[PDB]
């Protein structure tokens, strides 16, 4: 019966080959590059005792949550560098933080296997654990809010799950990966999401149904970060094989690879700009790179970190990009 | 310059900074450890005994606090993870040490233990992280060598030509064969450690029984050495 699977895989490969006529490079060749982009440090957010893994902006584009392995979530006022909140976590080994679109909640997860959801707006003045989501048999690598009541978690166990925050049960359990899922990016419309795992593969999922709608395989190693192009029909990845890749949901292929011979470290965070003309990637070579998505040339370098960039985030209106490194600092670049 | 409200906001930030400084003081004084070992490896006994004499169904990491000579130690053993390691091991690149507990009485799973040790030692993120390897279950190894039913040269052919090193220290007085066997195991692990050290981190062998009460002191002494080496590097002494 395995021969049937091999034949079907060959058929899918042939269909993808047939649907390919031109590459993004040829078609974009008649469009001018962004040129040299100089982005400067505007604010440095100090205060984390250990290294920073995760950082998620608020939809108000001013507030900002960050996670450190010292066991602390800090909410920042990016305009004034103030500390709005400091949430002591129950497990120090956090590797993901999320900020609710409404701004009422923040979530975190890590080696504890729980996604903890925090209530930022209470009658009392403190922030408290709204509830703890349990059920994963592996570390939670990413968590994203759909609304105040639904959250999507990705785990070291191949499962990505969908939870109802009211009474916390895995409403839909997404399975099909073979390795540890690392990144998780919701579509702008919150009906699909992409997962990048250690099987060097990415999958688009349908949240309402629970089925792997598409499966992308183009990488030579494990996949570390993922993000949607603002349009909702393309996404970009980062892998430890020192490359980024841009896949199109409708074309079901790879469009352009962002690589250079000099760089040999892995990408740890990928974030697009507001228009997608700039693709920002965080690396292990102490520095962050800014790429032109249409011409695949290094447009800029964001180099001010003394350790590896572990998180990277671009605000909803595109004014600033935040990057946090293993040196316990966030930098707000404009 | 800035309104009543911003001033108050700034005050809040300053109070938060004060609590964080306190957290920094507590964090710096506490040394973190990662406990690694197999299923047959007796790390469960070591963690239980250290919890006893010193100081939730799919939970992934277990926190074990203990204190030796007024020094605080946090020891973590991963509970609910899969076989794969190459991702969550990156989180432990700032620990004081990695305690690697091995079952020395297996003789058949011990090549797998060597492979795991060579995976830990050569990890790109675990460079500059020393390893306190606990060669656990010495009594079982002693009784197994004395009984003579199961051999050791059969699984490791080089055991025949191996001779007992002159720096051996079998203290209580034990048969020469058990000393030879345990130092052969130790020498295999130390060969892996020495092959590609480059001097940025060390491996500290210890022969352990899971019931022994001296394991905390062993960890304390090794951690003292590790911190001494780091501070030597930091204060421009080498």
């Amino acid at each position, epitope marked *: 019966l395995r021969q049937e699977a091999e034949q079907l895989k060959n058929q899918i490969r042939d269909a993808r080959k047939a649907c390919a006529d031109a590459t993004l490079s040829q078609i974009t060749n008649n469009i001018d590059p962004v040129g040299r982009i100089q982005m400067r440090t505007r604010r440095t957010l100090r205060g984390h005792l250990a290294k920073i893994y995760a950082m998620h902006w608020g939809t108000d584009s001013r*507030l900002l949550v960050s996670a450190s392995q010292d066991g602390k979530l800090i909410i920042w006022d990016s305009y004034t560098t103030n500390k709005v909140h400091a949430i002591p976590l129950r497990s120090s080994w956090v590797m993901t933080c999320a900020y609710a679109p409404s701004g009422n909640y923040v979530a975190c997860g890590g080696l504890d296997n729980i996604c903890s959801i925090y209530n930022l707006k209470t009658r009392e*003045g403190n922030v408290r654990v709204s509830r703890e989501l349990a059920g994963h048999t592996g570390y939670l690598s990413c968590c994203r809010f759909l609304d105040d009541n639904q959250i999507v978690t990705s785990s070291g166990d191949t499962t990505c799950a969908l939870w109802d925050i009211e009474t916390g049960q895995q409403t839909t359990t997404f399975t099909g990966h073979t390795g540890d899922v690392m990144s998780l990016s919701l579509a702008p419309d919150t009906r699909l999401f992409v997962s990048g795992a250690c099987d060097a593969s990415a999958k688009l999922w349908d949240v309402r149904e629970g089925m792997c709608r598409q499966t992308f395989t183009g990488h030579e190693s494990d996949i570390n970060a993922i993000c949607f192009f603002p349009n909702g029909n393309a996404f970009a990845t980062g892998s430890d094989d020192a490359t980024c890749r841009l896949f199109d949901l409708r074309a079901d292929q790879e469009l352009m690879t962002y690589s250079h011979d000099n760089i040999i470290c892995g990408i740890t965070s990928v974030s697009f700009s507001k228009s997608g003309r700039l693709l920002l990637a965080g690396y292990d070579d102490f520095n962050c790179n800014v790429w032109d998505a249409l011409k695949a040339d290094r447009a800029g370098v964001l180099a001010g970190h003394d350790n590896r960039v572990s998180c990277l985030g671009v605000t909803d209106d595109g004014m600033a990009v935040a990057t946090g490194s293993w040196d316990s600092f966030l930098k707000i670049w404009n | 310059t800035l*309104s*009543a409200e911003d001033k*108050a906001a700034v005050e809040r930030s300053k109070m938060i900074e004060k609590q964080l400084q306190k957290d920094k003081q507590v964090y710096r004084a506490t040394h973190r450890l990662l406990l690694l070992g197999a299923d047959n490896s007796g790390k469960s006994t070591i963690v239980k005994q250290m919890r006893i004499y010193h100081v939730v169904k799919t939970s992934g990491i277990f926190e074990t606090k203990f204190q030796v000579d007024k020094v605080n130690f946090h020891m973590f053993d991963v509970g609910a993870q899969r076989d794969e390691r190459r991702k969550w091991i990156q989180c432990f690149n700032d620990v004081t040490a990695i305690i690697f507990v091995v079952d020395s009485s297996d003789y058949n799973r011990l090549q797998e233990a060597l492979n795991d040790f060579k995976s830990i030692w050569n990890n790109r993120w675990l460079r500059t992280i020393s390893v306190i390897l606990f060669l656990n279950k010495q009594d079982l190894l002693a009784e197994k060598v004395l009984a003579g039913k199961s051999k050791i040269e059969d699984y490791f052919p080089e055991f025949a030509r191996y001779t007992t090193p002159e720096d051996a220290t079998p203290e209580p007085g034990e048969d020469p064969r058990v000393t030879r066997a345990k130092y052969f195991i130790r020498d295999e692990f130390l060969r892996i450690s020495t092959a590609s050290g480059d001097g940025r981190h060390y491996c500290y062998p210890h022969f352990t029984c899971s019931v022994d009460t001296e394991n905390a002191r062993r960890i304390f002494n090794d951690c003292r050495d590790i911190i001494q080496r780091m501070h030597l590097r930091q204060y421009e002494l080498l």
Partner: single-chain antibody, 232 residues
């Protein structure tokens, strides 16, 4: 959350008293606290404010030296050391809770009040419109306020606050920073203005919407209030 305050009574002129405000149901240590008094038939006046961490203590000019404010965060009680009680010190003193960060809602909870009866310059003035607006239920009203100095700041925040006071219990917050409806306020209430002239609108009144409407500025100390507007 609740703020219960006590320690008041008939006091002879020139005497002293220590007003205490017991707080429970919220994280006291992270809140700043205000003392607001109102004369027996007049509007509200600010007495003092103590910050979280006690690093900022402000007093009104009228009580600049006689009064002293303190807090006991462990024991969770707010104190007011009053000395040399003159005859303008006959009022009901209110305990108010204020927290300050981006997006915060100051002056949200007001304590019940202590009654204290005594036997026989460059400050911002806030002026209400006629202190009587008789309106039938189901209509819409547009209570107005005027400020001497433009409450808008370079931040982009205009610091106008709207409070409602039933004929009975302590005031409750309705609008903070000029356009934001407090936790629990119905969507009928809406606030607007242009920096100096302000308006609060209630879209469709009810029988429970009656009381006296006070404004407040938080642009700079001291906190001045205004006379208040009565609805009947």
């Amino acid at each position: 959350v609740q703020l219960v305050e006590s320690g008041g009574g008939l006091v002879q002129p020139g005497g002293s008293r220590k007003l205490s405000c017991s707080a429970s149901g919220f994280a006291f240590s992270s809140f700043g606290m205000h003392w607001v008094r109102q004369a027996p038939e007049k509007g509200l006046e600010w007495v003092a404010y103590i910050s979280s961490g006690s690093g900022t203590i402000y007093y009104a000019d009228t009580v600049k030296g006689r009064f002293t404010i303190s807090r006991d965060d462990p024991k969770n009680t707010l104190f007011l050391q009053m000395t040399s009680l003159r005859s303008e010190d006959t009022a009901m003193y209110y305990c108010v809770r204020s927290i300050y960060y981006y997006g915060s809602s100051p002056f949200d909870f007001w304590g019940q009040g202590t009654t204290l009866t005594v036997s026989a310059s460059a400050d911002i003035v806030m002026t209400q419109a006629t202190s009587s607006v008789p309106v039938t239920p189901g209509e819409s009203v547009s209570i107005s306020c005027r400020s001497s100095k433009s409450l808008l700041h370079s931040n982009g925040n205009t610091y106008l606050y709207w409070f409602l006071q039933r004929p009975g219990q302590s005031p409750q917050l309705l609008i903070y920073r000029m356009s934001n409806l407090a936790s629990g306020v119905p969507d009928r209430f809406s606030g607007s203005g242009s920096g100096t002239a302000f308006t609060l609108t209630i879209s469709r009144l009810e029988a429970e919407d009656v009381g006296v409407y006070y404004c407040m500025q938080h642009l700079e100390y001291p906190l001045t209030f205004g006379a208040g507007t009565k609805l009947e």
